């Protein structure tokens, strides 16, 4: 048994890779690690086939982790009723019926033209005023917060008010309780909401979720717990874009090919959700129910294990020359939406905004690149997902 | 002719009346004035008769000023097109009829009910978070600018950011450069708005705007200055009440009177308006047409002439013991809202806003009380309208 590994939390201004799970990696493909909270150290699989395999075997569960205290890098955890990162089968299955409608292909191109509309709103708006904006703060943040109201269902005489909860993004962490404020408005606002529509018709999130309490296919106390990721899930569009457009924006290479090929950036926004690394260590892990092992390590049942899509994302043996950036790379099966049935509920969603995003702002913003240099851009800290908190640009206007 | 007299700008933290604007008053009913910037001088009427008249009488011109530099409180002078303000018969007429049906005593009753939701949420918003708040940021800022951006039209994805555009009002000002901006968002989201709606049966400000526009009744260019003002008038409701809450927080014997006649608070919210000293200085003065004489003085054919209704409003003549806030006060007569074809487009709507604000707040937050002593509550400076800047306040929570 490997001996335990201390993981602090990250304090990098960029969009480096971890230099501890660099190491990690090297360790070998299985390792105990320790990080800043929680108690114990748990197991973690650094390998693609073993991170992909875990992932998918119905040996480990993630319902056992509510009911423990595995090592974690939050410094607390209160998992609600009704989430589906914590959901098994059956009931893993049976929350996503009362959601996932509005989250398919066909509704995602079906809303496409709407959200095409919102993000011209917001370009315009900084076009009007002029070259120095801030697009994190008027373009990112705001941008998946208004499509992803319509996907939910938001009424509009409460866009504002769930836009200024949702709003709760923090700065970083602009507010303790400032956020609890948030939430906890925006919590009381969405029980009330799906207790209304307590039998409506409507493909939105907050009817069908509304319908299905109301007839015990998912009863309140799963209300939160079903709806409040989602409803906040734009935030990840948020940071995981803002790292894209900042490789973008100081690797003047990059822009260059994303600019050149109009109507085939598939690839290229693929290689980059690859190699970002989107959180800063790892998250939700799973708890080893039947005693197994894994790839020569022997895992004792009740051990908890995590795995890390990040690491995976960066196997040799499946991405050759895994550190550097392709953007015309082959297949790439990246894990960055994860992969079984915990799999992404946004993925797609998320995929088609990011597409609006790089293409809507490369066509209306000529001349886009830093309004500073890159050293002045902050990221964010003591956070889950990695990203800059802002990203100062400028671009041509009038002589 | 009487002497020029300086009447500079003035650093008051509180409600008192302008001392300056209390000499000019006694040293007679037609004295000279010379504000802060512009050219030269301008003639001023203290006297309610004097105000009311000159007010009402077609030989004093508005549009006239806007091709002059005559002295003002304002550093720039830089009228826009379509603007009420400095309309004239029939252009006034004929701008007023484009929008003034969305302002109407009907319209505003079938806004009422609605209205009353907003604050309500607002309110539960506090209430929920307990007492320490500020009156201002957390109730009286946003109210305003949400109904009004009701009457107005904006659509609803969009209110988030025409609100935060329209928070080119701050605090005393958060910047020149910046304001100069928030506005070029909104004004040109404004043009855009109306552009579309060409062809429009709505109620809405913006729609009967685009209808007109499109009919050439009140063609482009005159858009901004004709809805500008209005869309961003809830300001004046947000200082206004502002100072009407102060007096509450500040004056038991006030506050008693207010809490014992509900549904009979009228007599005492039209002698708070008249006692309040809305504005700083004077503001849109008009320039003689064909020569006049004015009680007893010669105002010269080209000379402007500025009123005062805050000092028409304290008229021995009209309001005996006119410094005391008396309230139950008989007819009351006072000219807050102006008189004559420029009177108050938004009379009537920012009334009904004041009767909810009281009402709802004296109702819903028992025991309101200032949570810090009033000498900390800091007053707007170097702005047109006069109000507090924050109202920090508690009231009654837990055992
Ligand atoms: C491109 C940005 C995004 C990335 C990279 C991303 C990535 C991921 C990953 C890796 C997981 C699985 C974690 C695990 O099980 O260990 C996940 C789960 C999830 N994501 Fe996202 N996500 C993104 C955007 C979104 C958005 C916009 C929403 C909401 C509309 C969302 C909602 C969810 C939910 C609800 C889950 C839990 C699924 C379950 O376990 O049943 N995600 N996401
Ligand atoms: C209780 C708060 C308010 C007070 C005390 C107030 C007072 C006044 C006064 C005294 C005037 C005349 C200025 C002059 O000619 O010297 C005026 C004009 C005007 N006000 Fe207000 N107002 C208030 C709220 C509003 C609101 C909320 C709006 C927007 C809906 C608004 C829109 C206007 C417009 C457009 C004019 C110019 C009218 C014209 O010349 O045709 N006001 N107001
Ligand atoms: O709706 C929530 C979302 C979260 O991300 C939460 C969290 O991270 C920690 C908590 O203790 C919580 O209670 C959380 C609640
Ligand atoms: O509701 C969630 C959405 C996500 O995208 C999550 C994620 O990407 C990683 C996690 O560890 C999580 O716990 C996530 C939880
Ligand atoms: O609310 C305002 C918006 C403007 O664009 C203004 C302006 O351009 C010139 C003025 O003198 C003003 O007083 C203006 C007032
Ligand atoms: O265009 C204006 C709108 C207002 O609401 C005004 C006001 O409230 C007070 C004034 O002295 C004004 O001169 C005002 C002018």
Same mark, same amino acid.
């Given at each position: 048994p490997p001996p335990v590994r201390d993981?602090?939390?990250?304090?990098?201004?960029? *969009?480096?890779?971890?230099?501890?799970?660099?190491?990690?990696?090297?360790?070998? *493909?299985?390792?105990?690690?320790?990080?800043?909270?929680?108690?114990?150290?748990?197991?973690?699989?650094?390998?693609?086939?073993?991170? @992909?395999?875990?992932?998918?075997?119905?040996?480990?569960?993630?319902?056992?982790?509510?009911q423990r205290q595995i090592?974690?890098?939050?410094?607390?955890? @209160?998992?609600?009723?009704?989430?589906?990162?914590?959901?098994?089968?059956?009931?893993?299955? $049976?929350? $996503?019926?009362?959601?996932?409608?509005?989250?398919?292909?066909?509704?995602? @191109? $079906?809303?496409?033209?709407?959200? %095409?509309?919102i993000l011209?709103?917001? /370009?315009?708006?900084?076009?009007?005023?002029? *070259?120095?904006?801030?697009? /994190?703060?008027?373009?990112?943040?705001?941008?998946?917060?208004? /499509?992803?109201?319509?996907?939910?269902?938001?009424?509009?005489?409460?866009?504002?008010?769930?836009?200024?909860?949702?709003? %709760?993004?923090?700065?970083?962490?602009?507010?303790?309780?400032?956020?609890?404020?948030? @939430?906890?408005?925006?919590?009381?606002?969405?029980?009330?909401?799906?207790?209304?529509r307590a039998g409506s018709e409507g493909g939105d999130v907050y009817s069908m979720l509304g319908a299905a309490v109301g007839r015990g296919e998912v009863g309140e106390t799963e209300a939160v717990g079903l709806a409040g990721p989602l409803?906040?899930?734009?935030?990840?569009?948020?940071?995981?874009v803002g790292q894209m457009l900042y490789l973008l924006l100081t690797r003047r290479e990059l822009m260059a090919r994303m600019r050149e090929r109009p109507g085939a950036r598939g690839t290229a926004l693929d290689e980059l959700l690859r190699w970002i690394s989107h959180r800063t260590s790892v998250g939700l892990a799973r708890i080893a129910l039947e005693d197994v092992e894994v790839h020569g390590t022997r895992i004792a049942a009740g051990e908890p294990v995590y795995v890390s899509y990040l690491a995976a994302n960066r196997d040799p043996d499946v991405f050759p020359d895994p550190d550097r950036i392709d953007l015309d790379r082959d297949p790439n099966p990246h894990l960055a939406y994860g992969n079984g049935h915990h799999f992404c509920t946004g993925? /797609?969603?998320?995929?088609?905004?990011?597409?609006?995003?790089?293409?809507?702002?490369?066509?209306?913003?000529?001349?886009?690149?830093?309004?500073? *240099?890159?050293?002045?851009?902050?990221?964010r800290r003591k956070t889950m997902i990695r990203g800059p908190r802002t990203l100062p640009c400028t671009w041509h206007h009038h002589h």
């Open positions: 993981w602090p939390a990250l304090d990098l201004d960029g *969009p480096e890779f971890d230099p501890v799970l660099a190491e990690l990696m090297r360790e070998g *493909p299985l390792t105990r690690v320790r990080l800043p909270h929680g108690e114990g150290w748990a197991w973690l699989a650094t390998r693609y086939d073993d991170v @992909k395999a875990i992932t998918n075997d119905p040996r480990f569960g993630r319902a056992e982790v509510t090592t974690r890098l939050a410094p607390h955890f @209160k998992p609600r009723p009704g989430s589906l990162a914590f959901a098994d089968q059956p009931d893993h299955n $049976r929350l $996503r019926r009362a959601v996932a409608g509005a989250f398919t292909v066909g509704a995602t @191109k $079906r809303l496409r033209p709407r959200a %095409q509309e011209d709103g917001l /370009v315009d708006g900084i076009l009007a005023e002029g *070259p120095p904006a801030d697009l /994190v703060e008027r373009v990112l943040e705001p941008f998946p917060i208004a /499509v992803v109201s319509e996907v939910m269902g938001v009424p509009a005489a409460d866009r504002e008010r769930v836009h200024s909860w949702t709003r %709760q993004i923090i700065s970083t962490s602009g507010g303790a309780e400032a956020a609890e404020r948030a @939430k906890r408005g925006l919590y009381g606002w969405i029980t009330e909401t799906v207790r209304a409803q906040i899930g734009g935030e990840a569009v948020t940071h995981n993925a /797609v969603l998320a995929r088609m905004q990011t597409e609006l995003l790089v293409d809507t702002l490369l066509e209306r913003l000529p001349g886009l690149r830093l309004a500073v *240099p890159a050293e002045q851009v902050a990221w």
